Amino acid sequence: IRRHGSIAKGVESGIIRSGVMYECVRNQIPFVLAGSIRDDGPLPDTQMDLIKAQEEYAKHLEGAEMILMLSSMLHSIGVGNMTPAGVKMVCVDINPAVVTKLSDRGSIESVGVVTDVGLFLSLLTQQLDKLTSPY
Amino acid sequence: RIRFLMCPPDHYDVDYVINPWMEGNIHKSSRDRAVEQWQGLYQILKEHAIVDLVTPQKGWPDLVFTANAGLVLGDNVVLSRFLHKERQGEEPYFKEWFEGNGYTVYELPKDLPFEGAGDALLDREGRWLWAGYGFRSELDSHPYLAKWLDIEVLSLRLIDERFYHLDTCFCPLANGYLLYYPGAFDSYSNRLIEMRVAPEKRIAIAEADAVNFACNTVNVESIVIMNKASDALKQSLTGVGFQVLETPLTEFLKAGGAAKCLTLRVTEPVRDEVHANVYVESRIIRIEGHLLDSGLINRALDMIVDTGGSFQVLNFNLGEQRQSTSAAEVKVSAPSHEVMEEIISLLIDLGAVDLPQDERDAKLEPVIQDGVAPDDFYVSTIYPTEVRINGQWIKVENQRMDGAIAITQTPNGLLAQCKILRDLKAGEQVIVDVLGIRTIRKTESREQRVSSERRVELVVEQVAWELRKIRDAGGKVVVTAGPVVIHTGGGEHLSRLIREGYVQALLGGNAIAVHDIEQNMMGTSLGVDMKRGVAVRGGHRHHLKVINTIRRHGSIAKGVESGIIRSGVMYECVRNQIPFVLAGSIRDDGPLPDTQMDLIKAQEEYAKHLEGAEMILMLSSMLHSIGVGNMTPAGVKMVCVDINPAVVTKLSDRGSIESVGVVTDVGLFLSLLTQQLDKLT
Amino acid sequence: TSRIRFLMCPPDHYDVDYVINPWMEGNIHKSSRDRAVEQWQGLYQILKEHAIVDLVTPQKGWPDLVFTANAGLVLGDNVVLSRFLHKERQGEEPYFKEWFEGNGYTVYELPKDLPFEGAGDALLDREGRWLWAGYGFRSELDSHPYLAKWLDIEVLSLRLIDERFYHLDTCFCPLANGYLLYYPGAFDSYSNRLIEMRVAPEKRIAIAEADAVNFACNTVNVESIVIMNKASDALKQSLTGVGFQVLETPLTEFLKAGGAAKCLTLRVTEPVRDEVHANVYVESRIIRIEGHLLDSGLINRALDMIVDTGGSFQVLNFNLGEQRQSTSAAEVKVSAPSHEVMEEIISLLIDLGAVDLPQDERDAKLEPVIQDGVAPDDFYVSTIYPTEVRINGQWIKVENQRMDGAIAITQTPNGLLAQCKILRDLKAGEQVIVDVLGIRTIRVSSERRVELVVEQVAWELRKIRDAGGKVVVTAGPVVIHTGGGEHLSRLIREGYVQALLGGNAIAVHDIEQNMMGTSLGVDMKRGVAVRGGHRHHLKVINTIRRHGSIAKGVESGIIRSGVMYECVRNQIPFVLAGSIRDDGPLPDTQMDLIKAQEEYAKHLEGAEMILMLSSMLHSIGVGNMTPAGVKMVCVDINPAVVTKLSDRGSIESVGVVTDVGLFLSLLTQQLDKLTSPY
Amino acid sequence: ILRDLKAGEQVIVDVLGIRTIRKTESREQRVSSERRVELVVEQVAWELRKIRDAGGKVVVTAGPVVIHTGGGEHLSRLIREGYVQALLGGNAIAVHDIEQNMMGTSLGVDMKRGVAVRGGHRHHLKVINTIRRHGSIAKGVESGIIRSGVMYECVRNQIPFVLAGSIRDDGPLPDTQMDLIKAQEEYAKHLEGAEMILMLSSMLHSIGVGNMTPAGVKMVCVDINPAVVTKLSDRGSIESVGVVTDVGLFLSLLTQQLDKLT
Ligand SMILES: NC(=O)c1ccc[n+]([C@@H]2O[C@H](COP(=O)([O-])OP(=O)(O)OC[C@H]3O[C@@H](n4cnc5c(N)ncnc54)[C@H](O)[C@@H]3O)[C@@H](O)[C@H]2O)c1
Ligand SMILES: NC(=O)c1ccc[n+]([C@@H]2O[C@H](COP(=O)([O-])OP(=O)(O)OC[C@H]3O[C@@H](n4cnc5c(N)ncnc54)[C@H](O)[C@@H]3O)[C@@H](O)[C@H]2O)c1
Ligand SMILES: NCCC[C@H](N)C(=O)O
Ligand SMILES: NCCC[C@H](N)C(=O)O
């Protein structure tokens, strides 16, 4: 990816053909990769100026009606701190302590579930299918 | 010519239970060893002073505890009003004695408990009064004390029920010395103590001495009298010219009292300067909603008391139906302005409001240094907020938690916007204090809410030994640490390790530094009470205040140099010139100016200090532990402590010969570590 | 009286201007007034083909005036005018009121601040026999007796528990000929039981979530015609199968605000029968509670308890106390939808120190024990707290206090004796306290891993069944607590389980879940509760002991479904091994553990596979008895348990760390997939 | 199994003439703060001495994790010096405590290095066979083969114990009550008058004892699983205190803080 210069060029060149990042690129979903101290590389797309990363996070959080926080303590807290009340928040993690901390804006705003995030996503998509079947 | 008031144990007993020491001891009193122990005190004291006596009375066995009779200064005395009715009958007899010895007697309202010199201790040079509260004396009696004794009153809060009276854990001595037990007081009170009493005059005793009622000491000039003392106590007392005289008082420890409690000095130092000074503040707030069933009113009262204030519910208007709204007016008291601010901030969230005639404009202060808020800036929350500017309520924009509120006059009118600290610009007006702020949350929003210990001791033995060997051999040890080190009490121990040569470099993030500094500067740590071991809900003001302050001084080193940072992990790093790196993170508040937010550079800096390392100590940092791991070649001993068994396993790919791991409490680990290190000399 | 007339209101001033239900969230000003006008005209015009439609004058600033269903409730010449919970709709009331007055109705008005939102929340039985009335989100329970008296009709109360279905007419729809279109998941266990008692199974059309979120229950039924927003064709076939004609007309612009066809209409010509008169099942009891109510938050805890259990309240007075440390006193009128719910509520308030007002004190009710070790029906269940009971106008202390017993009153030389006894100690001829009168107290494996073990285990189970081999299940009560019971009973009914080994607990809770929809008082419809009473639990144990066995409970008809039911009906042998913490126990439970081990061993003979579902004590017991060569499948959320059980290696031990319920859910759905090439 | 053997049967001893016939592939294969904790210990220790001086009644329920974690010696000490008027448990705690004192092992656990071990069954069954031979634990002690540990101290100071059977029991010991109706009656009998109940990693026996125990009884629940500690605290913060740690750790602190009180 570093040789190509970006994730998008990896998609344009044909070497990335499927997956999460692929779909963000092909459907033009904006994404932000915030750097960390343990990053390998990193990818060219990754923002290693964290002042900027926070600002980009904040910009993309404007107008959000809902935030899905999938098994990511460092990033979910980062996002919580930037988010005003009134935004539905869904926190998925296997550690009960993480979910407890993130879920403290109460039932009408904080929904927490302690489960494997993969199983959760599997049930979520299969549930979304069920809502489609009366067409 | 000093006079003490005492009362003979002729009808002494434990008839009932009103403090924890009395538990079980009902009718377990030996009147004769009581009589004889009481004599020992009596006789010793007449060898140094005049002793007057109260006529003992059948049916009031606690009359022997004359320290609670009242509080005497000059010709004035404030009569004790007892909380428990088991002792209220003592009041006429104590009153009779005071009036028969010429004193002007002041009596508190019959609803303000106050329990005498036993709960309120004079500074022996007579400069101020230390009044306690928490269990027996109400906070709201303190301004009556100042008014009537014409003296400066300093409020201390009692948090441990064992030390339910101030004189059981606090004891002013001759020539400015203080015998106190810091663990009976909350963080705000300990801070008050340290700022009035210079460190060389402070005598903090251990828990062992304190449960033998060591603070419950009569001090007559250079003579101190008490029940028992460890010789570690006798050593310090003599070390500044105090002669310690012991005498058994065990039969009275069973009702809850010792030497001090059995006496009341009625000859006290009236000074020169003194005049009435009280720091206690009071405010009436109003709360409206479904108070009884939302548990709204009940959560408000909890925030008030837990933060260190008191309340009086002045009136309740009950709505006519379940869906009718109710209203409550509540008088709030705080021991200082700072604690009142803490309390009003939490209440603003719950939607408490000023009475509409006491509405006032928010207070404003200019920014003068880019990225630094003025002192005492209000800390924003996640909730929708209005502020009052020249008589008008204005909506705050870009609402976010842990920010400040900036006010501007624009071509389009008044603008109130929430800004994080580092975005503030010289010239902006910022809300300080807590007037003219309310929340506009809607109804329903407001109405709602694996490793063995013995295994562990094994590892500690192993690590400790290899850790000294490396220090003697002039080697290099690196530490990576997360905030859980602070939260669990590990801080003092890591301070100690750095101070005594075990740590050549420290690698962490923003949070560990902010939390360590918060804890040393204010005795708190956001999200955690490190004086009782469980989590707490608020704490954001203390946290942002530390961030704003270090940003003001411009670095941690200048915080230390300027003397505002006097202790703890980061302090020791600066004092012993131990290099530290703080690598930024996406979740960082502020950040501190020391924090490296360029992560390419942060990685280069981490690598630079890892060179030559012979051991790496990884203390609950997970993210920084892995980062350091990737950078570290083989041949480097790696010790990984974390409570999550998943990260400890994640960090041990170097086999049982280079990496050792344990799944416990890192504070526990660092205690054992520091103990086992002491046994090695 | 054969001409049908409806009230509606055109959308001239309609938009979503605020949020007062979950549907409006995120939809402020997202209504297309063109599609809204066109969609309302579709419904208006279809309706005029079958009925009379009158119109209210639309009004600026009151967009939800189009939902005339909430205007009020009409029966004959009387209407109860609705009072809205939210002020955003309260300005509608005068316009509705004047429409009703202009059309000659007698208008009854509830007390101010007592919410009731009309036919939207109260639905008449189509033959006019009674009125179904909802509560939980908008209407107050205490509105219901007003409806019964003023409209002169029997009123049945239903508790809504899902905020998406905040009005009865979004999830419940009485139809011609006694049929009922409804969504069970919108209701608590009591309410579902009440629905099933009044409407025969062949008359119930329970719909699926996919239909409910399209507002399929929000249906206008004229005669054999049903009009709605959208129906899946499974729902069309069910409805047309019993003779209804389904008319669809899109109403999505109105779904954005939380309403559809039925919400947009109000029938003002309703069937009035002379033999139909006022009847109330709602009960109320004034209660008194004292202490530091504001500090300890006791008042808050009790009110929350009343509302969680299905009841309501009204604080009649609150006395602060005249000095700072003095106690507070509150008198609270508590109400419940039935006598049964009032007993669960009063039991919880007793446990907390609530007492009767002096003038309301009554003696405890007593019933005799006719069979040793069996209490009479509706015996009071005791707590840990010290307890006094009123016998013959006098209060006496209860001895040997212990939770989960009965209170036996007996005569002795010198005086009356009240003692707490566990059920099995009760003796014939003893009097036992029933009802709640005259009682008071004094102060982890990855997704891919899980999916691969499920594939492997399902293929294994199908294979053993087809070959006529033997599979044994060991299970603990967590299978039921977490929600996995119906998956296990399905395994047992479809032939995958040849023997079940367990304990007293799993049988008690499975039978509790199937008789009363609760497990340890936790309603499965809601997920969890503020804990839950032991009454349901104890009634089960008592009822089975009276019958004499689980099988007799099935023969008698009181156990109709569940794990134990399937074992009995398919003759799957089971063994219930006793333990030190057993309540009761059930008669079926083996309390001689030498024998229990021998029975376990006998049933383990020939086993090719053992499913160990979340049961450490029993799974280890079973492991020790089982030779190598038996496939073993261990499911538990604690990694340590699974590690210990899985030490016969990969070819024999399969372990997965996951919730046993989810596991069973994936297992059954996997077994279905293996069936679909037939 | 041992209890099915009959006088006259021949039984294999030693290890000659035994082989396994496993097939190829079969053979070729294979939340609570520390400081919080020190708080509770301080509280429990103090209330525990107060009750002992006042001649009160303290009951202990204990599971094998007490032995495995090193807690044994400390519980021995508590019983020996008057803090425990009754002991309630199961088969396993007794077998493990006796195994450990008699052979310094404990099935499934190495209590000299703090991690689990794989074998240990011979030592375990040998203890069971031996006590069954003497016919009771008291006669094991009297005959001098049991010289130390929890069950030893119970017998030496005449502290009543109940061992309630379980479906997983090996043996069982002849002392173990396998009639659970009776076992419940026996537990209840010794819980009368109790002023405190100390619940040391027993979960199953802790709940059993809980159901039987009226209010006004102080209940201390130590377990490493945070789920059972929460399960046992329905008596509010004034009657039930709980901690989520190592029970051996707990009992060490407890015994240390008890020493500081003299
Ligand atoms: N190759 C690289 O460059 C690299 C590699 C690793 C991490 N990083 C960076 O380190 C930072 C930390 O990443 P993070 O947010 O994943 O760590 P995190 O500390 O925030 O932990 C994520 C959470 O997932 C939970 N968890 C574990 N298994 C789970 C499961 N099955 N289901 C649900 N939850 C589960 C954990 O309890 C944790 O709270 C990231 O920003 C990351 O990009 C970079
Ligand atoms: N009412 C009664 O009479 C009654 C009540 C309770 C227990 N008992 C008896 O006590 C004995 C102990 O019962 P037990 O076997 O259930 O206890 P157990 O100690 O054996 O624990 C069962 C296991 O389930 C695990 N667990 C918890 N939640 C889980 C989840 N979602 N998914 C998967 N695993 C989960 C636990 O880690 C545990 O290892 C039983 O014999 C029981 O009948 C009787
Ligand atoms: N300061 C000693 C007071 C002791 C007395 N029994 C009391 O509880 O007030
Ligand atoms: N069933 C119609 C009610 C819909 C309306 N918007 C409300 O929230 O009341």
What sign does the CA torsion over B300, B305, B310, B315 have? positive
- Name the DSSP letter for residue C65: G
Roughly what angle, to the nearest 10 degrees, separates helices D34-53 and B666-678?
A: 80
Residue B584, φ and ψ in degrees, nearest 5:
-65, 175
Beta bridge partners of B284: B331
What is the rounded distance in angstroms from the CA atom of residue C465 to the CA atom of residue C471? 8
Please give the torsion angle defined by the CA atoms of residues D224, D227, D231 and D232, in that order, rounded to the nearest 10 degrees: 10
- Name the DSSP letter for residue C56: P
* Burial classification of residue B638, based on how many CB atoms lie within 10 Å of its CB (0-12 exposed, 13-18 middle, 19 or more buried): buried
CA of A33 to the centre of ligand 1 (A): 14
CA D176-D178-D180 angle, to 5 degrees, is: 120
What is the rounded distance in angstroms from the CA atom of residue D173 to the CA atom of residue D231? 30
Please give the torsion angle defined by the CA atoms of residues A39, A40, A44 and A50, in that order, rounded to the nearest 10 degrees: 10
Contact B573, B408 (CB under 8 A): no
CA of A101 to the centre of ligand 1 (A): 16
Q: Chain centroid to CA C467: how far? A: 41
Find the closest chain D residue to C616 by CA distance: D168
What is the rounded distance in angstroms from the CA atom of residue A66 to the CA atom of residue A81? 15
Q: Which of D155, D151, D102 is nearest to D125 (CA)?
A: D102
Q: Set out the domains of chain B in order of their start, with CATH numbers.
A: 3-269 (3.75.10.10), 452-680 (3.40.50.10690)
Structure resolution, Å = 2.4
Active-site pick, B169, B261, B418, B640? B261
Tokens of C253: 């612009």
Q: CB distance A118–C213 less than 8 Å?
A: no
CA of C481 to the centre of ligand 2 (A): 10
SS3 for chain A is: CCCCCCHHHHHHCCCCCCCHHHHHHHCCCCCCEECCCCCCCCCCCEECEHHHHHHHHHHHHCCCCEEEEECCHHHHHHHHHHCCCCCEEEEEECCHHHHHHHCCCCCCCEEEEECCHHHHHHHHHHHHHHHHCCC
Contact C585, C578 (CB under 8 A): yes
Task: Establish whether B52 is an annotated binding residue.
Answer: no
- Name the DSSP letter for residue B114: B
Q: How far is C83 from chain B (nearest CA, A)?
A: 12
Residue B22, φ and ψ in degrees, nearest 5:
-75, -10
Tokens of B626: 């892995």
What is the rounded distance in angstroms from the CA atom of residue A113 to the CA atom of residue B598? 35
Task: Establish whether C504 is an annotated binding residue.
Answer: yes
**Number of residues in chain B:** 681
Contacts of C483 in chain A (CB under 8 A): none
CB-based pocket (< 6 A), ligand 2: C 476-478, 482, 503-505, 508, 579, 581-583, 585, 614-618, 636-638, 641, 659-660; D 203-204
What is the rounded distance in angstroms from the CA atom of residue C642 to the CA atom of residue B194? 54
Nearest CB to C579: which of D26, D179, D180?
A: D180
Separation of first and last alpha carbons in chain D: 50
Contact B615, B466 (CB under 8 A): yes
Q: After which residues is chain C broken (C to N over 2.5 A)?
A: 443
Tokens of D73: 């010696």
CA C305-C306-C309 angle, to 5 degrees, is: 80
Helix or strand or coil: residue C653?
strand
* Burial classification of residue B563, based on how many CB atoms lie within 10 Å of its CB (0-12 exposed, 13-18 middle, 19 or more buried): exposed
Q: Which chains touch A (3 or more CB pairs under 8 A)?
A: B, C
Give the residue ranges of DSSP H helices in C155-285. 189-198, 209-212, 233-241, 252-255
Give the residue ranges of DSSP H helices in C160-204. 189-198
Contact D169, C580 (CB under 8 A): no
SS3 for C353-406 is: CCEECHHHCCCCEEEECCCCCCCCCCECCCCCCCEEEEECCEEEEEECCCCCCE
Residue A52, φ and ψ in degrees, nearest 5:
-65, -45
**Number of residues in chain C:** 678
Nearest CB to A116: which of C26, C232, C446?
A: C446
Tokens of D261: 């009180």
The one-letter code for the residue type at B555 is: S
Q: CB distance D33–B665 less than 8 Å?
A: yes
Contact A132, C232 (CB under 8 A): no
From C638, C645, C658, mutation site for ligand 2 pocket: most ligand atoms within 8 A of C-beta: C638
What is the rounded distance in angstroms from the CA atom of residue C32 to the CA atom of residue C455? 48
Task: Establish whether D217 is an annotated binding residue.
Answer: no
Tokens of B192: 């008050």
Q: Which chains touch C (3 or more CB pairs under 8 A)?
A: A, B, D
Cα distances (angstroms) measured from residue D9 to each of D2, D5, D6, D109 = 12, 7, 6, 33
Atom of ligand 1 nearest to the CA of A33: 43
- Name the DSSP letter for residue C83: B
What is the rounded distance in angstroms from the CA atom of residue D37 to the CA atom of residue B534? 10
Give kind and range of the element (H or E) at residue A123.
Answer: helix A117-132
CA of C7 to the centre of ligand 4 (A): 16
Contact D241, D198 (CB under 8 A): no
Contacts of D216 in chain C (CB under 8 A): 386
What is the rounded distance in angstroms from the CA atom of residue B577 to the CA atom of residue B569? 12
What is the rounded distance in angstroms from the CA atom of residue B408 to the CA atom of residue B415? 5
Beta bridge partners of D255: none
Give kind and range of the element (H or E) at residue C90.
Answer: helix C87-90
Chain C positions touching chain B (beta carbons under 8 Å): 85, 111-115, 140, 142, 294-295, 297, 299-300, 303-304, 307, 312-315, 317-318, 320, 323-325, 330, 640
Q: How far is C26 from chain B (nearest CA, A)?
A: 16
Q: Residue C426: CB partners within 8 Å, gap ≥ 6? A: C369, C372, C373, C374, C375, C406, C408, C432
- Name the DSSP letter for residue B66: G
B555 in contact with chain A, both atoms CB, cutoff 8 A: no
What is the rounded distance in angstroms from the CA atom of residue D99 to the CA atom of residue C442? 47
Tokens of B132: 């306690």
Helix or strand or coil: residue B496?
helix
Contact B195, B189 (CB under 8 A): no
SS3 for C113-140 is: CCCECHHHCEEECCCCCCEEEEECCCCC
Contacts of B400 in chain A (CB under 8 A): 81-84
Q: Which of C440, C513, C506, C499 is nearest to C470 (CA)?
A: C499
Cα maximum dimension of chain B: 86
What is the rounded distance in angstroms from the CA atom of residue B452 to the CA atom of residue B662? 9
Give the residue ranges of DSSP H helices in C165-266. 189-198, 209-212, 233-241, 252-255
Q: Which of D91, D95, D209, D76 is nearest to D155 (CA)?
A: D76
B169 is an active site residue: no
What is the rounded distance in angstroms from the CA atom of residue B86 to the CA atom of residue B59? 9
Cite the annotated binding site of A for NAD(+) by residue number. 40, 72-75, 93, 116-117
Contact C130, C163 (CB under 8 A): no
What is the rounded distance in angstroms from the CA atom of residue C340 to the CA atom of residue C347? 11
Tokens of D226: 């945070």
**Residue linked to tokens 């803490």:** B342
Contact D31, D224 (CB under 8 A): no
Active-site pick, B142, B165, B540, B543? B165
SS3 for B84-100 is: CHHHHCHHHHHHHHHHC
B360 in contact with chain A, both atoms CB, cutoff 8 A: no
Contact C271, C124 (CB under 8 A): yes
Tokens of C447: 């997704």
**Number of residues in chain D:** 262
Beta bridge partners of B663: none
Find the closest chain B residue to D38 by CA distance: B533
CA of C16 to the centre of ligand 4 (A): 11
Tokens of B525: 């740590």
